[PDB]
C-alpha cells in the first residue's frame, strides 16, 4: 500500500482515489500524539509525492473518528518554554496546512466523535460527510485554552464568525443535525452508507462537478464580514462571553480576540495570531489548574471501575419520606431509569413529593427540553405508598426521614424487617453519625450513608459515608447507584460533617471572626465572589439559612472542641437570636431579592469586638487558610482516601472555583512551604489556622499534593 | 360537509342550512317564515320525536339517579385488580375523573401494560392541545401501581378485572375481601360469569355487585351495574 504506519494507513482505491484511514493499532481510539502526527506527516508526503493520486479520503477504523490526545501529554507540552511550544505547534499545523494544500479533492468521512484535533483535522479537508450519530466539537476552553491546530482559523471562515465563537467559547459537542445547519459538515448520512457517500462525493469533486478548489479558498483568505460588521459581531461576542464566563476564565474571551485580530489575514498569519494566545494561555494559572481537575477526574474513574467490579446494580430503589428531599431523590432515581418507591406516613407527605416531581418534569417539557412521553416514563417510575408491601424486592433503600437520631434509628430498624437481608440501606443524614445509626440495625454490614445536597436535582455530589461496619460491597452498590443518578459520588468515612460540610464551617468561622473584627460583610463576600466562589460567605449563610447554620455549628463544636468551639457569640448567634433566619425568612445578613438593609448593622453590633482594619488579601486568607488546612486534616485523618477525592469533594459539593483546582491544589499553587508560612502569620487567630505537623514536614521535603 | 358527517338520517342539520340558504336575500320577517317553514316540518319527522324521546328517557334516568345518591356512599379511594387492557382503562378513567385508584396485579409486567396505555391516552390528549401537561400529571399521579394489599386499608370500592375464570375470580374476590373495610364495596367486571355465583364465595355478599365496562373502557358510555341476588341497595347505589 502507498503507506503503512502504526496509526495511519494510506490504501489505494478505484479510479486512482486513495483512502487515508486512522487506525491506531493497540489502543481503542484515535488521538494526535507524537506518533500520529509524525505519521500523518509521512502519509501526506507519500500522497503529495505520488503523482498517481487523484483523490483523497480521510476515514477512521475505530468507533470514534479522532478524539483528543492524552491529557498527560498536554501537561507535558505546556511545560516547555514558549519559543519551543510555538515551534512545536507550527510544525504540527504545517502537517495539516500541507494536507489542505493538496492539489487533490479531499473529503473527511466523519464516522464518530471528532473532538479538538480530531475536528481540526477535518476542518483541513475540502468537503466533509458525517454520520447521523456522530458528533463534533472544540472542547478546548474546558482546559483553559482554545483550538490550537488552526481551529480558530478555519471554523470562522467555514460556519461564520458568530457561530465559530459560539462553538469555541462553549466547547459543546455538536450533533449531526445542527452540524449541517451551520455548514460545518457538507453532507449527513447513516453509518452504513457513509463510506459510499464519501467515495461518491470524491468522484464528483474529481470530475469537476463540484468546484473543490473554490470551496477550500474561503478559509485561505480574510473573513467576509465588513468592517462595521466585524466590530459589531466581535464587540458583542466579547461583551456576551465575558459577561457570562467571568474574569477568571481568559480562554473564552481570548478566543474572540484571536479571531478579531486575524480578521483580515490569510491562513498563515491567522495561524500565528492563534498560537500567539494559545502559548500564553497554556502558561496561565487557570489552564494547568483546570487540567488538574481533569487529571483528578481520571483518578476518580480509575477508582470507579474498581467499584463496579463488585457493585450490585440497583433495579428497584426505595426512599423513605416524600417532600423536599423525598421528591428529589424520587425524581432523580426515576429520571435516570430506576424505579423507586416513595414511602411516607400520611397522604399529605406523598402529595408533597408528587408535587415537585411534576413542576420539574413539567418545566422540562414546557420548554421542549423533555418529551411528554418521556415525562410519562418518569412519573410512572415514581410509585407512592404508605406500607411496606412492595418492598419485597427493593435492592437499595434511601432513608430521608426527619433529622432525628431517635427517629431514624426506629425507621431504619423497621424497614430492615421488610427487605431482603442483602438489601442495602442508606441514610441521607447530614448531622447524625452513620456508624451510630448502624448500631440500631441487625445487619449493619449493609448500612451505609448516601448524602445528597439540596436541591437533590441540582447538586452533582453525593457523599457515600462508609460507616465503621459498612462493607466494601455495601458501599460499591451505593456509589454505582449514585453515579447512575447522573451524580458524582465520593466515598467519605463517617465523621462529624463528613467532608463538604466539615470543610465549609471552618470557612464560615473565618467569616465569623472577620465580622466580629469590624469588617463589613458586604465587602467580605464581594471579595470572595471576586475570588471565584459562586456566592459569598454572607449570602451563602442566608441561602442555607441561619437557623441551619446555627445548628450545624453546635454539631461541629461537639465534634472537634480543640478548634471548632468558640467561647464568644458570633455574628450567627446575633442573627439567629434576632430571628433573621435568612433568605428563607426574608431576612438574614441581607434582606429579601438580594438587598442591603441597615437594620442588620444594629443586630451585629454586639458582636463587633475589635475594629481591626484589614486588607483585601488578608480577608481572602482569613477564609481560605482555615478551609484548606481543614481539607488537609480530612485527608490526613483518612476521612478521604486520596487527595484528588477530597479536592473534588469540594469542586462538586462546595462549588470550589474551578480555575483554582481545589482546596489542596490551591496549596500546591501557592507553595506548600509558602502556604505554611502564610498560615503562621495568622496563627494568632486560632487553632484553626495552625498547620499540621505532617504538613510542615512535606512543606520542608519539597513535597506537594498533586506535584 | 354537514351531510357528509351528520348522515342522511338526521335532517335537522342540513335543513338548518337550506333555511339559511333560502332566506339569503330576505329581511327579518320573510327570513322568519323560511325558519318556521322547516321548523314545522321537522317537529313532525320521525327523527325529531324519536330523539326527543331519548331526552325524555334521560329525564327518567336522572330522576331515578337522585334516588340513588340518597344512600350512595361516594368513592374517594378506588382499587382495580389486574392491569393491562381493562385494568389500564378503569385505572385511566377513574383517575381522569378525579378519583385515585390502586392498580394491583401479580407481576411487574402486568402493571407495565396498564401504565403504558395510561400514557398513550393522556399523551395523545396533551399532544393535541386538548390536555394540559399539568393535568396529565394529576392523572398519572392518581394511578398508583402495586403488587400487595398494604394500601387497601381505606379503599371504598374495589373493581376486580382479573381473567375470565370463575375459579380464579372466586379466589381473588375472596382474598381481597380480607384486606379492605367490611363496608367496602367489591365489584366484578365479569361478562360471562354469574355475579350471584361469584358472590357465594365471599363472606359479605351484601357488598358485592357487578360493574361491567365495555372495551375500550375509555370509549363506551355504558356501565352495567349487575345487582346480584344478595346485592344491597347501597352496594349498588355506590
Ligand atoms: C453549609 C451546608 O450545610 S451545605 C449547602 C451547599 N450549598 C451550596 O454550596 C450552594 C449551592 N452551590 C451551587 O449552586 C454552585 O454554583 C455549584 C455547586 C453548582 C458549583 O458547581 P460547579 O462548579 O458548576 O461544578 P462543575 O459542573 O463546574 O464541575 C466541573 C466540570 O465542568 C467542566 N467545565 C469547566 N469549565 C467549563 C466550561 N467553561 N464550560 C463547560 N464545562 C466546563 C469541567 O471540565 C468539569 O467536568 P469533568 O468533571 O467531567 O472534568
Ligand atoms: N436543610 C435542607 O434542606 C437539607 C439539606 C441537606 C440534607 N437534608 C436532609 O434531608 C432530611 C430531611 O428531609 P426533608 O427536608 O424532606 O424534611 P421535611 O421536614 O421537609 O419533610 C419530612 C418528610 O418525611 C416524612 N416522614 C417523617 N417521618 C417519616 C417516617 N417514619 N416514614 C416515612 N416518611 C416519614 C414526612 O411525612 C415528610 O414528607 C434530613 O436527613 C436532612 O439532614 C436537608
Ligand atoms: N375481550 C375483551 O377485551 C373484554 C371485553 C369486555 C370485558 N372484558 C373483561 O375483562 C376481564 C379480562 O381483563 P383483560 O382483558 O386484562 O385480560 P388479559 O388476559 O388481557 O390480562 C389479564 C391481567 O390480569 C392479571 N391477573 C391475573 N390473575 C391475577 C390475580 N390473581 N391478581 C391480580 N392480577 C391478576 C394478569 O397479570 C394480567 O395483567 C374479564 O373479566 C373480561 O370479561 C374483556
Ligand atoms: Zn445559640
Amino acid at each position: 500500500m502507498i503507506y503503512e504506519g502504526k496509526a495511519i494507513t494510506v490504501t489505494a482505491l478505484e479510479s486512482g482515489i486513495v483512502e487515508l484511514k486512522f487506525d491506531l493499532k493497540g489502543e481503542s481510539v484515535n488521538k494526535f500524539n507524537r506518533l500520529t502526527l509524525n505519521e500523518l506527516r509521512q502519509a501526506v508526503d507519500a500522497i503529495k509525492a505520488d503523482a498517481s493520486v487523484k483523490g483523497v479520503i480521510v476515514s477512521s477504523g475505530k468507533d470514534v473518528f479522532i478524539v483528543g490526545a492524552d491529557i498527560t501529554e498536554f501537561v507535558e507540552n505546556f511545560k516547555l518554554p514558549d519559543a519551543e511550544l510555538i515551534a512545536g505547534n507550527l510544525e504540527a499545523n504545517k502537517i495539516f496546512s500541507d494536507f489542505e494544500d493538496l492539489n487533490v479533492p479531499t473529503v473527511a468521512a466523519i464516522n464518530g466523535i471528532a473532538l479538538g484535533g480530531g475536528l481540526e483535522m477535518c476542518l483541513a479537508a475540502d468537503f466533509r460527510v458525517m454520520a447521523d450519530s456522530a458528533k463534533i466539537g472544540l472542547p478546548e476552553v474546558k482546559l483553559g485554552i482554545y483550538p490550537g491546530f488552526g481551529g480558530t482559523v478555519r471554523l470562522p471562515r467555514l460556519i461564520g464568525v458568530d457561530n465559530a465563537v459560539e462553538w469555541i467559547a462553549s466547547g459543546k459537542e455538536n450533533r449531526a443535525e445542527d452540524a449541517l445547519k451551520v455548514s460545518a459538515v457538507d453532507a449527513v448520512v447513516t453509518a452504513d452508507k457513509l463510506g459510499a457517500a464519501a467515495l461518491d462525493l470524491i468522484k464528483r469533486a474529481i470530475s469537476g462537478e463540484l468546484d473543490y478548489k473554490a470551496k477550500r479558498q474561503p478559509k485561505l483568505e480574510k473573513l467576509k464580514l465588513n468592517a462595521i460588521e466585524q466590530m459589531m459581531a466581535f464587540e458583542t461576542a466579547k461583551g456576551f462571553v465575558a459577561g457570562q464566563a467571568g474574569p477568571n476564565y481568559p480562554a473564552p474571551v481570548e478566543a474572540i480576540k484571536t479571531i478579531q485580530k486575524a480578521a483580515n489575514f490569510g491562513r498563515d498569519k491567522a495561524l500565528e495570531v492563534e498560537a500567539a494566545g494559545f502559548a500564553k494561555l497554556a502558561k496561565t494559572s487557570a489552564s494547568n489548574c483546570l487540567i488538574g481537575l481533569f487529571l483528578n477526574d481520571q483518578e476518580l474513574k480509575k477508582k470507579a471501575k474498581v467499584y463496579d467490579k463488585i457493585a450490585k446494580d440497583v433495579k428497584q430503589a426505595a426512599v423513605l419520606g416524600a417532600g423536599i428531599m423525598g421528591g428529589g431523590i424520587a425524581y432523580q432515581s426515576a429520571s435516570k431509569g430506576t424505579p423507586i418507591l416513595m414511602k411516607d406516613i400520611n397522604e399529605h407527605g406523598i402529595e408533597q413529593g408528587l408535587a415537585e416531581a411534576a413542576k420539574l418534569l413539567v418545566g422540562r417539557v414546557d420548554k421542549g427540553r423533555m418529551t411528554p412521553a418521556k415525562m410519562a416514563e418518569v412519573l410512572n417510575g415514581i410509585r407512592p405508598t404508605l406500607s411496606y408491601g412492595d418492598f419485597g424486592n427493593v435492592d437499595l433503600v434511601v432513608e430521608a426521614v426527619v433529622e432525628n437520631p431517635k427517629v431514624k434509628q426506629a425507621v431504619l430498624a423497621e424497614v430492615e424487617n421488610h427487605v431482603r437481608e442483602d438489601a442495602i440501606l442508606a441514610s441521607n443524614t447530614s448531622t447524625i453519625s452513620i456508624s451510630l445509626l448502624a448500631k440500631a440495625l441487625k445487619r449493619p454490614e449493609n448500612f451505609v450513608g448516601m448524602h445528597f445536597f439540596n436541591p437533590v436535582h441540582m447538586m452533582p455530589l453525593v457523599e457515600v459515608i462508609r460507616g465503621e461496619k459498612s462493607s466494601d460491597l455495601a458501599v460499591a452498590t451505593t456509589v454505582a447507584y449514585a453515579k447512575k443518578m447522573g451524580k458524582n459520588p465520593i466515598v467519605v468515612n463517617d465523621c462529624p460533617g463528613f467532608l463538604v460540610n466539615r470543610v465549609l464551617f471552618p470557612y464560615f468561622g473565618g467569616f465569623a471572626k472577620l465580622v466580629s473584627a469590624g469588617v463589613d460583610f458586604v465587602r467580605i463576600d464581594k471579595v470572595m465572589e471576586k475570588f471565584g466562589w459562586p456566592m459569598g460567605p454572607a449570602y451563602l449563610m442566608d441561602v442555607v439559612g441561619i437557623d441551619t447554620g446555627h445548628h450545624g455549628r453546635d454539631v461541629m463544636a461537639e465534634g472537634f472542641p480543640d478548634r471548632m468551639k468558640d467561647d464568644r457569640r458570633s455574628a450567627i448567634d446575633a442573627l439567629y437570636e434576632a430571628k433573621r433566619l435568612g433568605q428563607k425568612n426574608g431576612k438574614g445578613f441581607y434582606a429579601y431579592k438580594k438587598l442591603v438593609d441597615s437594620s442588620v448593622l444594629e443586630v451585629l453590633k454586639p458582636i463587633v469586638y475589635e475594629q481591626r482594619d484589614v486588607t483585601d488579601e488578608d480577608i481572602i486568607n482569613w477564609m481560605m487558610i482555615p478551609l484548606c488546612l481543614e481539607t488537609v486534616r480530612c485527608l490526613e485523618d483518612g476521612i478521604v482516601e486520596t487527595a484528588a477525592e477530597a479536592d473534588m469533594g469540594l469542586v462538586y459539593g462546595i462549588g470550589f472555583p474551578l480555575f483554582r483546582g481545589g482546596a489542596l491544589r490551591y496549596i500546591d499553587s501557592i507553595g506548600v512551604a509558602e502556604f505554611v508560612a502564610l498560615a503562621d502569620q495568622y496563627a494568632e487567630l486560632g487553632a484553626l489556622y495552625h498547620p499540621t505537623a505532617k504538613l510542615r514536614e512535606m512543606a520542608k521535603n519539597g513535597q506537594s499534593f498533586f506535584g
Side-chain angles (χ1 to χ4, degrees), chain A residues 1-5 7-24 26-30 32-33 35-41 43-61 63-78 80-180 182-192 194-221 223-282 284-301 303-308 310-314 316-350 352-363 365-368 370-373 375-405 407-438 440-525 527-564 566-586 588-635 637-707:
Chain A
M1 55 192 85
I2 301 179
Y3 179 77
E4 190 180 3
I8 302 178
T9 39
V10 182
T11 310
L13 299 174
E14 61 175 302
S15 304
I17 303 178
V18 61
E19 182 194 67
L20 178 161
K21 174 175 295 183
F22 282 103
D23 188 357
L24 176 58
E27 310 300 299
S28 65
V29 299
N30 275 296
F32 285 94
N33 53 59
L35 177 61
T36 308
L37 283 162
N38 289 168
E39 284 201 357
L40 198 174
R41 164 74 290 183
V44 180
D45 288 305
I47 304 180
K48 190 170 165 288
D50 185 356
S52 66
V53 183
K54 296 298 179 181
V56 184
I57 308 182
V58 180
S59 59
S60 169
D63 281 305
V64 302
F65 185 65
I66 302 178
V67 302
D70 294 305
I71 185 57
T72 305
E73 312 192 314
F74 281 73
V75 190
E76 312 185 305
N77 281 47
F78 307 133
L80 314 175
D82 277 47
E84 287 185 49
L85 178 62
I86 312 176
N89 296 306
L90 171 63
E91 183 178 298
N93 274 301
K94 288 183 182 177
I95 298 177
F96 293 152
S97 300
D98 279 301
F99 176 92
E100 170 179 287
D101 290 308
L102 259 45
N103 186 53
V104 152
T106 58
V107 178
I110 307 175
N111 62 300
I113 299 49
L115 300 180
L119 200 176
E120 296 175 296
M121 164 69 243
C122 294
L123 300 177
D126 301 310
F127 305 76
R128 288 171 296 297
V129 181
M130 168 173 65
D132 59 11
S133 58
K135 293 187 169 187
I136 62 178
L138 301 174
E140 318 303 2
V141 299
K142 276 115 168 296
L143 300 174
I145 56 182
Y146 56 61
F149 299 124
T152 69
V153 175
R154 309 204 177 73
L155 193 64
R157 305 167 209 293
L158 291 177
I159 65 178
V161 181
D162 297 282
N163 293 297
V165 182
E166 179 177 297
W167 269 45
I168 299 181
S170 64
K172 63 186 177 186
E173 305 192 319
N174 299 292
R175 299 166 180 286
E177 185 173 59
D178 339 302
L180 186 171
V182 296
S183 289
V185 181
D186 307 300
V188 174
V189 293
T190 77
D192 305 308
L194 194 179
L199 189 285
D200 167 282
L201 191 170
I202 281 292
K203 288 178 175 174
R204 293 167 183 294
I206 297 181
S207 67
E209 196 186 319
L210 299 182
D211 197 311
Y212 77 107
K213 284 282 185 175
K215 179 185 189 317
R216 186 193 306 176
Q217 179 53 49
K219 50 187 179 66
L220 305 181
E221 61 190 61
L223 274 176
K224 292 177 178 293
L225 275 66
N226 204 311
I228 319 302
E229 296 303 305
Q230 272 179 46
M231 193 192 289
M232 182 67 250
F234 290 122
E235 297 300 344
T236 54
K238 300 165 64 176
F240 175 65
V241 176
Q244 175 186 60
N248 312 296
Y249 303 71
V253 189
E254 282 300 304
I256 309 179
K257 294 179 177 180
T258 294
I259 303 181
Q260 177 178 60
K261 291 185 64 179
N264 308 291
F265 301 158
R267 176 217 303 171
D268 301 314
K269 278 184 175 57
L271 294 169
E272 283 188 54
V273 183
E274 188 178 68
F278 185 73
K280 173 188 290 63
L281 295 185
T284 59
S285 176
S287 176
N288 58 175
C289 227
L290 291 175
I291 299 179
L293 287 174
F294 210 100
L295 288 172
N296 295 174
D297 203 13
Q298 293 295 167
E299 290 174 49
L300 293 180
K301 292 183 179 180
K303 297 176 179 297
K305 294 183 178 180
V306 178
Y307 283 164
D308 289 295
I310 61 180
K312 306 184 64 170
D313 180 289
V314 182
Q316 180 60 60
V319 59
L320 303 177
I324 301 180
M325 295 304 266
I329 309 181
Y331 174 76
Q332 285 291 161
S333 187
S335 302
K336 294 300 180 179
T338 295
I340 188 177
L341 313 177
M342 192 189 284
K343 200 284 186 182
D344 201 297
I345 54 179
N346 56 62
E347 183 61 10
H348 170 284
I350 295 182
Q352 291 304 305
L354 296 171
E356 295 308 300
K359 297 187 178 183
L360 308 178
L361 293 169
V362 172
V365 184
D366 270 49
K367 283 189 178 181
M370 178 180 237
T371 310
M375 182 174 102
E377 308 184 65
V378 187
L379 290 169
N380 291 305
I382 309 178
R383 306 184 188 185
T385 181
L386 299 172
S387 60
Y388 301 78
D390 302 299
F391 281 63
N393 59 184
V394 182
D395 302 300
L396 177 152
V397 176
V398 179
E399 163 274 294
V401 189
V402 184
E403 253 302 318
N404 183 301
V407 181
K408 298 189 183 301
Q409 273 190 167
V411 185
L412 295 175
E414 182 175 61
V415 183
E416 193 167 64
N417 294 306
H418 293 297
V419 297
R420 302 203 304 290
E421 58 179 64
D422 65 307
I424 299 69
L425 298 179
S427 183
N428 181 60
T429 179
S430 299
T431 70
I432 303 177
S433 177
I434 281 60
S435 296
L436 196 175
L437 296 172
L441 306 179
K442 55 176 64 176
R443 307 190 305 283
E445 321 83 61
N446 306 302
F447 182 63
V448 302
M450 178 175 247
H451 188 186
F452 296 81
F453 303 74
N454 189 303
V456 189
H457 63 66
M458 297 298 278
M459 312 318 276
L461 182 57
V462 174
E463 298 193 68
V464 183
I465 295 64
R466 170 160 50 199
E468 59 178 57
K469 283 292 186 297
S470 297
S471 65
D472 302 352
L473 196 166
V475 177
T477 298
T478 311
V479 178
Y481 179 49
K483 186 69 177 65
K484 189 171 74 173
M485 286 189 275
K487 296 303 178 183
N488 306 298
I490 297 184
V491 184
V492 178
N493 283 302
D494 183 63
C495 75
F498 302 147
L499 183 281
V500 187
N501 281 56
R502 174 178 170 181
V503 176
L504 219 176
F505 279 78
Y507 178 65
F508 275 152
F511 173 63
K513 295 184 183 300
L514 281 173
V515 182
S516 303
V519 182
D520 188 9
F521 67 81
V522 187
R523 179 169 100 71
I524 302 182
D525 59 46
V527 177
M528 302 312 281
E529 288 187 52
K530 167 184 179 59
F531 185 65
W533 294 89
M535 294 183 270
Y539 182 54
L540 204 173
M541 271 293 270
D542 297 305
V543 181
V544 179
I546 297 62
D547 51 57
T548 302
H550 179 283
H551 172 58
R553 192 190 67 181
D554 296 52
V555 184
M556 294 306 273
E558 307 169 57
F560 307 76
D562 63 303
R563 53 183 156 70
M564 307 188 118
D566 195 302
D567 64 299
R568 298 195 255 176
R569 283 179 56 270
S570 65
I572 311 174
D573 291 306
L575 290 177
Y576 184 69
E577 288 162 37
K579 298 180 180 184
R580 270 175 156 291
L581 314 187
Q583 186 186 60
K584 62 161 57 69
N585 188 58
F589 274 83
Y590 293 71
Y592 308 81
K593 301 172 187 178
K594 180 179 174 292
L595 291 170
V596 184
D597 59 313
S598 53
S599 53
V600 187
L601 299 167
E602 309 180 61
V603 185
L604 296 171
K605 183 182 174 183
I607 312 306
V608 179
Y609 303 131
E610 33 287 1
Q611 201 59 47
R612 182 166 176 171
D613 294 289
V614 56
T615 71
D616 285 310
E617 185 175 60
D618 298 303
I619 301 180
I620 299 185
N621 296 302
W622 274 55
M623 305 290 244
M624 294 304 280
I625 301 178
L627 190 163
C628 293
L629 288 175
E630 184 55 53
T631 299
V632 180
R633 302 201 190 74
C634 286
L635 197 175
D637 295 308
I639 272 62
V640 185
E641 180 171 54
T642 64
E645 286 173 293
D647 209 51
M648 291 307 281
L650 297 171
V651 189
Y652 289 150
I654 204 176
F656 200 90
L658 302 170
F659 71 101
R660 290 185 184 303
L664 303 177
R665 176 176 264 74
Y666 179 62
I667 296 181
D668 287 60
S669 294
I670 302 180
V672 183
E674 292 86 304
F675 181 67
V676 184
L678 197 178
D680 294 314
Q681 291 179 55
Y682 299 72
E684 53 92 58
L685 275 176
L688 286 178
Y689 299 65
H690 294 201
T692 60
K694 205 92 174 183
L695 208 181
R696 293 176 176 298
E697 176 180 60
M698 63 183 287
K700 297 189 297 185
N701 300 301
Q703 294 180 293
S704 51
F705 290 75
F706 303 83

